[PDB]
Design a protein around this ligand. Structure first.
Ligand SMILES: CCCCCCCCCCCCCC(=O)SCCNC(=O)CCNC(=O)[C@@H](O)C(C)(C)COP(=O)(O)O
Ligand code: SF4
Ligand code: SF4
Ligand code: FES
Ligand SMILES: [K+]
Ligand SMILES: [Zn+2]
Lengths: 208, 126, 95, 688, 90, 48, 114, 86
């Protein structure tokens, strides 16, 4: 399996597993899962009440020092009752490492804003408000950042359609750009691409 | 206390920004998709799907393309169970109809039955 | 092999022509209906049938990798020629 | 229980003895790759793609054929299982033609997909390939036999399910060819399912050929209306146009098959279509008009009617929504004369009890029966997948089938008792030898065809058949849960029209002819203008101009079954709904929408606005029409039998002849099939 | 060398073939070697008998063997093309 | 192409045309397919 | 059924926040008509504000009306600060959109939509 | 003006439909013999409450709940329907 296969890094896998045990036993009040992927990335899945205590730990603990917030992300998974998966990607420059902190919310439960931990979060979770509708409590200036000013809905929700509900054009009667319900001259052609044969037996879910 | 008790039904229709015509006139269909009978593979029959009723597609006068005015015409949602799909449809105010999962019933297969002594299940060729 | 409708409009190689009462002819008023006059159905009928001495022939369309995927054509029917499904060149077993 | 314990990749699973390795792996959600195995065909074991390692066994076993032994650990993902799959895929792709861009199977090809999933990524075959002569098996199945991988699903289908025995393998070795060996035309009623089960592009649909491609098709799950079986289908559309019709798996109806009418009559759905409202001009010719003018001219005549002045004939393809729509509309005028084209006898109980006009056993209950008596029917062409279920019970359960009628080919062997209806009086008296066969049977089944009820003595035939069924069930060894009396319908609209309370047959219109007549899709020619008075106001509502539309005064363009969400009830009482695949063409509208708009123009507005409110009304008239994929059992055979003994109707001396004797009479029955160029090519191919 | 049949004027389903009555007695003796309900087991000898009377097998010997043994004609065509002794050409 | 001429084909244009936009010879798009749904034509004879 | 609140513990605090948001929009409408130089009246803009508040009047969940107050405050902040242009303010008045068919019969005449 | 049809909805198995079942097993045959040209549509279904629909002239329908009735109560309600004709 030498030339075409990505080489496995067992040293980083063992180190990130040990540090995941470390984080899980220092913070058992909030840590729900700890997992390390086969390409050696550490995920700490936490309860949403521990957004501030976990991230302040990883920012300030001498064996963590995750000083950089690389990215803050939501993922919409509509089959979960807490459909939004809030993803923090952190960089420790001291230990040359990355960690992922994952939590969850639904449409109505606010997540505590992490601007007091990372000021980098200020726009990112603001984007999570604009794209997903996740409210962040105690945010300094929480408002839309990417959509148009009167935009209804949250576009990166998976029940939000690809083309929206409205489209703009210039109307010369009112001398103004106007919003109308969207009509496409060509509908987006939905492709059903999935093969009906199983691709990866290692990821097979157990049946009913 | 730091937790409140809301006994009301979960309804987020005023927050999703969806116009009212595409809430109360749409029929969501919750279903496990049927197997393509062109193929024997069954991996596309594992999850529940939510689609909507197909609206009008008409001919573009310039090019002959399929024009639509339905924003939900390509919206297909994936769910692990039937109850997750029902909860998501009720949460969004969508009137839905649910088809039950159709599993193939277990077949009694015997290769020796191809060569029976006295039954009609003998194959005339092989 | 282009022809003309009684409206004066050229018929494409598909067979598309607008009706006389169709309003969409107004897009060609003062302009032109662009048709290609090299009909591929007429040009492949101009090619002669290749007489070969084999039972199975291979066609890749010429040019090797510049043609089409190489397919194998059976020539057991003497009633019908063996036509390439890609390029339309047709073959006959000479016996 | 006698379940044995086996292991799939170490996971324990309890299986019945006789379970194959493939089925045991299916019970833990692992699908073993296959080409020749099909769970509704007999086991062949010759593609060798299902080869799997059993541990502590130095030889792979064919998982489709090998029964599991107790304690086997099936290694579905081991190294030699994967090497076996790669080697077998290499041999399958050695001679296979490089046709994937020109082949219709591409994107929905089993060979492509499990070459991607289980085969290697490249070729070692440095030779020339074989090329196979194409065969001509008819206008439906395009045959490109170089693509054939010799899995023999052809032959097992045509032998076992279609009951034909005309496909086979000629030759030997690499020159072995699947075909008919002669110029022979494989035209069954079920001949299009070999397009489904061919894993490769060797057998493709000749009408569907080259037009679409599976990834760009939208899949609308819907219901067949070409007969009263209610076969579940997928209408696959592309950019607002119906591309083809595939089966859906419903284990209790159409297991995964459809008839060729169901599969190929969809091109009649884009010819001869009613797209705009038409009214008669001053010259007496149908000219196009708006919906306002047409509905006003119908409603002005409807307001001048009362009582028997207005009637309605329901056609064969009408959904229950439009049926109860037009029923409520004519009941506002105090008219009960709502008729169907297909005659069911109203003598005795009539359509009051559901049990005396249903397939009360089930389609699936044929697998539980041991004797089937077919009376006055040709179920091969009236209900082809009901006949396929009878053949599966014949093949696997050693079912005894007897027929009273003309000796038609049913693709299995039966006991032809004779075509005279007096045999029904001989079985009901015990003087006939098949009466003792029915008495000693444990699960008997008596199926009366609804085409035999089209005769003038249909009440006498129904009374004789019900007398046989109640002589059996009340006396012999029938449990009580078992239903003996059955009626096989052939019309998709018939059972919903009888549940809603229509009067079956047009004798109520021949009795006193109306001055206004609605024709919901009525193309049977049952009532023509020679039967009406001098100037009858005929309103045709439908989707094809075939028979009733040239004689109509106002044409109301309606939706077809692919064009509306619409309730149809099959011959066993199972209510089902279609879904909208495409919208109706032009100015055509959904049918109950038209009737409700007419009721609002006429000043007699019906109390529904949406489809759900029509279905609430439909539940109010009979609540089983909105319980979808549910067979509601109907009791009270004794009371219908006691009501059938009142009037002694006489049997005619004419023999029971079904209207469809051969495959010629199968392809064109309704307005969609008669407008089909594919069905016309099928008729021309079987008449030569 | 082909395994499809094309109707020629000397090989078609109206080519005259019929067994002699002594060949019918031989066919009865062949069929009596097999159990009742398995008359199809007499396909290979009787078809070979049709080759010993005629020298080769037109497609009327195959159809006659299919007719007198009550087997489908395709199941005789399979045998006649599978086995290398059956001369399907004269 | 004076040194290495292009390969001759019967379908290659003998007369090259420049950009014809803004002229009466310009490209006008249109659907190249035929009519999908055939309408029913009523009979030209009266119905009495 | 024990959920975490956003701002309001029950519906009374929620109605208080709704009521303050309505007061702020009512005060802002004349300034919005002036500085965007709109062609509507102050009465017409206040009727549109009342329409947008009465559109959400059926909600009984305190978290949902908290998010509605939050989004209304965001729209008001985009209006007071000139972040919207005149087009965004006039998108509440669907002026170029033709009136939809309301009854059954006109929807029957124009197309297939229920 | 008069009665046009009767519709009796009932369950096959529920005890609330039991008396309604006891009406059809015993008293439906002479009911149909007494009213030969009146459609009395018996509709069984899975979990419905028992119900007596009476459609009159010009589309008027009256509605009588037959839930938990005996056979005599179903007989009296149905003969009130037959004798009313309103
Ligand atoms: C120029 C155009 C500007 C447009 C401005 C758009 C602003 C939109 C803001 C929307 C904010 C809301 O709708 S929050 C209202 C939701 N409240 C509820 O669901 C609770 C019920 N509330 C009510 O009934 C309210 O009328 C009251 C005043 C709180 C109580 O009244 P009831 O007592 O009788
Ligand atoms: S049958 Fe499958 S693998 Fe073969 S040419 Fe067609 S798409 Fe390709
Ligand atoms: S044509 Fe298709 S189904 Fe028939 S044997 Fe060949 S691969 Fe199998
Ligand atoms: S699937 Fe078992 S060998 Fe073909
Ligand atoms: K195929
Ligand atoms: Zn070629």
């Amino acid at each position: 399996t030498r030339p075409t296969v990505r080489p496995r890094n067992d040293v980083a896998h063992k180190q990130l597993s040990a540090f995941g045990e470390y984080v899980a036993e220092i913070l058992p009040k909030y840590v729900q899962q700890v997992q390390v992927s086969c390409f050696s990335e550490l995920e700490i899945c936490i309860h949403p009440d521990g957004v501030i205590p976990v991230l302040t730990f990883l920012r300030d603990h001498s064996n963590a020092q995750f000083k950089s917030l690389a990215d803050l992300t939501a993922v919409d998974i509509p089959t979960r009752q807490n459909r939004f998966e809030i993803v923090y990607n952190l960089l420790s420059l001291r230990f040359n490492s990355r960690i992922r902190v994952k939590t969850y919310t639904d449409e109505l439960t606010p997540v505590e804003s992490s601007v007091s931990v990372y000021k980098a979060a200020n726009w990112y979770e603001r984007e999570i408000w604009d794209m997903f509708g996740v409210f962040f409590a105690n945010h300094p200036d929480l408002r839309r950042i990417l959509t148009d000013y009167g935009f209804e809905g949250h576009p990166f929700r998976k029940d939000f359609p690809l083309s929206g509900y409205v489209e703009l054009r210039y109307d010369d009667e009112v001398k103004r750009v106007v919003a109308e319900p969207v009509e496409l001259a060509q509908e987006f052609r939905k492709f059903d691409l999935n093969s009906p044969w199983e691709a990866f037996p290692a990821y097979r879910q157990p049946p009913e | 206390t730091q937790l409140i008790t809301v006994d009301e039904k979960l309804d987020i229709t005023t927050l999703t920004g969806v116009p009212e015509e595409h809430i109360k006139t749409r029929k969501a269909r919750i279903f496990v998709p049927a197997r393509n009978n062109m193929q024997s593979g069954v991996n596309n029959t594992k999850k529940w799907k939510m689609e909507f009723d197909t609206r009008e597609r008409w001919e573009n006068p310039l090019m002959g393309w399929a024009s639509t005015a339905d924003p939900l015409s390509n919206l297909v949602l994936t769910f692990s169970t039937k109850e997750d799909a029902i909860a998501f449809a009720e949460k969004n105010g969508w009137s839905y109809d649910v088809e039950e999962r159709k599993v193939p019933k277990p077949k009694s297969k015997s290769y020796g039955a191809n060569f029976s002594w006295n039954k009609r299940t003998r194959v005339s060729t092989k | 092999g282009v022809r003309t409708s009684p409206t004066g409009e050229k018929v494409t190689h598909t067979g598309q022509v607008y009706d006389d009462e169709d309003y969409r002819r107004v897009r060609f008023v003062g302009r032109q209906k662009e048709v290609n006059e090299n009909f591929a159905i007429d040009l492949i009928a101009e090619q002669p049938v290749s007489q070969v001495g084999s039972r199975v022939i291979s066609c890749d369309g010429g040019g090797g990798a510049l043609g089409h995927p190489r397919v194998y054509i059976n020539l057991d029917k003497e009633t019908k020629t063996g036509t390439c499904g890609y390029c339309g060149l047709q073959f006959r077993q000479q016996h | 229980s006698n379940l044995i314990e086996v292991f799939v990749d170490g996971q324990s699973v309890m299986v019945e003895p006789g379970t194959t390795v493939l089925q045991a792996c299916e019970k833990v959600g692992m699908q073993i790759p296959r080409f020749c195995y099909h769970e509704r065909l007999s086991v062949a074991g010759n593609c060798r793609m299902c080869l799997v390692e059993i541990e502590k066994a130095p030889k792979v076993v064919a998982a489709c054929a090998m029964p599991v032994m107790k304690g086997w650990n099936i290694l579905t993902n081991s190294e030699k299982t994967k090497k076996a799959r790669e080697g077998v895929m290499e041999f399958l792709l050695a001679n296979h033609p490089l046709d994937c861009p020109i082949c219709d199977q591409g994107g929905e090809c089993d060979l492509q997909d499990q070459s991607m999933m289980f085969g290697s990524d490249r070729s070692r075959f440095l030779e020339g390939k074989r090329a196979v002569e194409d065969k001509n098996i008819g206008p439906l199945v395009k045959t490109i036999m170089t693509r054939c991988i010799q899995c023999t699903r052809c032959i097992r289908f045509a032998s076992e399910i279609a009951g034909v025995d005309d496909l086979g393998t000629t030759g030997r070795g690499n020159d072995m060819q699947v075909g008919t060996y002669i110029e022979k035309m494989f035209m069954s009623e079920l001949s299009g399912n070999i397009i489904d089960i061919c894993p490769v592009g060797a057998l493709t649909s000749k009408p569907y050929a080259f037009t679409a491609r599976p990834w760009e098709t939208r899949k609308t799950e819907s219901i067949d209306v070409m007969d009263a079986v209610g076969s579940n289908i997928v209408v696959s559309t592309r950019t607002g146009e119906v591309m083809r019709i595939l089966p859906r798996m419903h284990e209790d109806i159409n297991e995964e098959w459809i008839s060729d009418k169901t599969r190929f009559a969809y091109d009649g759905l884009k010819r001869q279509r009613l797209t705009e409202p038409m009214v008669r001009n001053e010259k007496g010719l149908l000219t196009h008009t708006t919906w306002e003018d047409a509905l006003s001219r119908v409603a002005g005549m409807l307001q001048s009617c009362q009582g028997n002045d207005v009637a309605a004939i329901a056609g064969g393809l009408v959904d229950a929504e439009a049926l109860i729509a037009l029923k409520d509309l004519l009941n506002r005028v105090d008219s009960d004369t709502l008729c169907t084209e297909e005659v069911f006898p109203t003598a005795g109980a009539g359509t009051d009890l559901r049990s005396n006009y249903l397939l009360n056993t089930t389609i699936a209950g044929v697998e539980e029966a041991d004797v089937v008596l077919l009376v006055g029917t040709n179920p091969r062409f009236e209900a082809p997948l009901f006949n396929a279920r009878i053949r599966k019970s014949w093949l696997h359960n050693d079912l005894k089938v007897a027929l009273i009628g003309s000796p038609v080919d049913l693709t299995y062997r039966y006991d032809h008792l004779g075509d005279s209806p007096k045999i029904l009086q001989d079985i009901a008296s015990g003087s006939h030898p098949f009466s003792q066969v029915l008495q000693e049977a444990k699960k008997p089944m008596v199926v009366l065809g609804s085409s035999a009820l089209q005769r003038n003595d249909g009440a006498a035939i129904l009374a004789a058949v019900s007398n046989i069924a109640q002589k059996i069930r009340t006396s012999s060894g029938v449990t009580g849960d078992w239903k003996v009396m059955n009626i096989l319908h052939r019309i998709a609209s018939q059972v919903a029209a009888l549940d809603l309370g229509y009067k079956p047959g047009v004798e109520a219109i021949r009795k006193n002819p109306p001055k206004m007549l609605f024709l919901l899709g009525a193309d049977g020619g049952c009532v023509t203008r020679q039967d009406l008075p001098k100037d009858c106001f005929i309103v045709y509502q439908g989707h094809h101009g075939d028979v009733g539309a040239p004689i109509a005064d106002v044409i109301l363009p309606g939706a077809a079954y692919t064009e509306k969400s619409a309730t149809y009830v099959n011959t066993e009482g199972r209510a089902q709904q279609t879904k909208v695949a495409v919208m109706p063409p032009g100015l055509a509208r959904e049918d109950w929408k038209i009737i409700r708009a007419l009721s609002e123009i006429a000043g007699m507005t019906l109390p529904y606005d949406t489809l759900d409110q029509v279905r609430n009304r439909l539940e109010e008239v009979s609540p089983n029409l909105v319980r979808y994929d549910d067979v509601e059992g109907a009791n009270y055979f004794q009371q219908a039998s006691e009501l059938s003994k009142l009037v002694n109707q006489q049997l005619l001396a004419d023999p029971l002849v079904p209207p469809q004797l051969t495959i010629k009479d199968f392809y064109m029955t309704d307005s969609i099939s008669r407008a089909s160029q594919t069905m016309a090519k099928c008729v021309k191919a079987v008449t030569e | 060398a082909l395994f499809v049949h094309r109707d020629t004027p000397k090989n078609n389903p109206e080519t005259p073939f019929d067994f002699t009555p002594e060949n019918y007695k031989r066919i009865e003796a062949i069929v009596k070697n097999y159990p009742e309900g398995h008359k199809a087991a007499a396909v290979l000898p009787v078809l070979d008998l049709a080759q010993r009377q005629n020298g080769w097998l037109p497609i009327s010997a195959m159809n006659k063997v299919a007719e007198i043994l009550q087997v489908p004609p395709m199941r005789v065509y399979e045998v006649a093309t599978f086995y290398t002794m059956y001369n399907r050409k004269p | 192409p004076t040194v290495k001429p292009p390969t001759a084909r019967k379908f290659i244009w003998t007369n090259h045309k420049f950009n014809l936009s803004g002229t009466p010879q310009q490209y006008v798009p249109y659907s190249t397919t035929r009519k999908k749904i055939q309408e029913w034509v009523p009979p030209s004879t009266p119905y009495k | 059924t024990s959920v975490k609140p956003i701002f309001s513990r029950d519906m009374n605090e929620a109605k208080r926040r709704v009521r303050e948001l309505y007061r702020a929009w009512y005060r802002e409408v004349p300034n919005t008509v002036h500085l965007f130089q709109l062609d509507i009246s102050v009465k017409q803009g206040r009727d549109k504000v009342r329409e947008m508040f009465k559109k959400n009047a059926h909600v009984t969940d305190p978290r949902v009306v908290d998010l509605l107050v939050i989004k209304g405050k965001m729209e008001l902040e985009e209006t007071i600060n000139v972040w919207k242009q005149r087009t965004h303010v006039m998108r509440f008045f669907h002026e170029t959109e033709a009136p939809r068919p309301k009854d059954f019969l006109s929807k029957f005449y124009v197309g297939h939509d229920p | 003006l008069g009665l046009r049809e009767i519709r009796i909805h009932l369950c096959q198995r529920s005890p609330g439909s039991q008396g309604v079942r006891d009406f059809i097993e015993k008293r439906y045959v002479e009911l149909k013999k007494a009213n030969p040209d009146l459609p009395i549509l018996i509709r069984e279904c899975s979990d419905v409450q028992p119900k007596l629909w009476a459609r009159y002239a010009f589309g008027q329908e009256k509605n009588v709940s037959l839930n938990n009735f005996s056979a005599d109560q179903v007989t009296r309600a149905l003969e009130n329907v037959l004798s009313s004709k309103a």
